[PDB]
Curated annotation (Swiss-Prot):
This major soluble protein in olfactory sensilla of male moths serves to solubilize the extremely hydrophobic pheromone molecules such as bombykol and to transport pheromone through the aqueous lymph to receptors located on olfactory cilia. GO terms for molecular function: pheromone binding. One of its GO terms (biological process) is response to pheromone. It comes from Bombyx mori. Belongs to the PBP/GOBP family. Keywords: Disulfide bond, Pheromone response, Pheromone-binding, Signal, Transport. Antenna. This is Pheromone-binding protein. The chain holds residues 23 to 154 of 164 of the full protein. Disulfide bonds join 19-54, 50-108, 97-117. Homodimer.
Amino acid sequence: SQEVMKNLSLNFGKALDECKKEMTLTDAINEDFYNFWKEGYEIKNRETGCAIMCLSTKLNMLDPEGNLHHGNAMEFAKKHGADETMAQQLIDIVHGCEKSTPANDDKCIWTLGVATCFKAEIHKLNWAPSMD
Ligand SMILES: CCCCCCCCCCCCCCCCI
């Protein structure tokens, strides 16, 4: 559901401010988040990946390192309105994307790659929202 992807995006972004008084980042990132679900948009700023990883770690979906906590990621989805089957589809995609993106000590760059892959698969389902 697009409606459910919108609420998940909004709620994922609530932790963002805060991250900011904790990593201190820029208007390039706000532009990337604003554009995230636009078709064909490409994220080019490394520090957007840092933001996503900060966000996810604050929500307990990433560990110290960047392996997804599947259980906590399911719980986030369900918290913000995914039913069991949508949540399980989402986790599978993120897990597929971790497997497919190359190892990188640079976790900010690793995150961008996973997050690109994720966005792509969400478009393929027609679940990318108009953040409107
Ligand atoms: C399973 C829940 C996803 C919820 C919100 C999506 C918004 C954008 C962040 C998702 C991309 C994840 C990228 C790196 C893996 C850490 I979950």
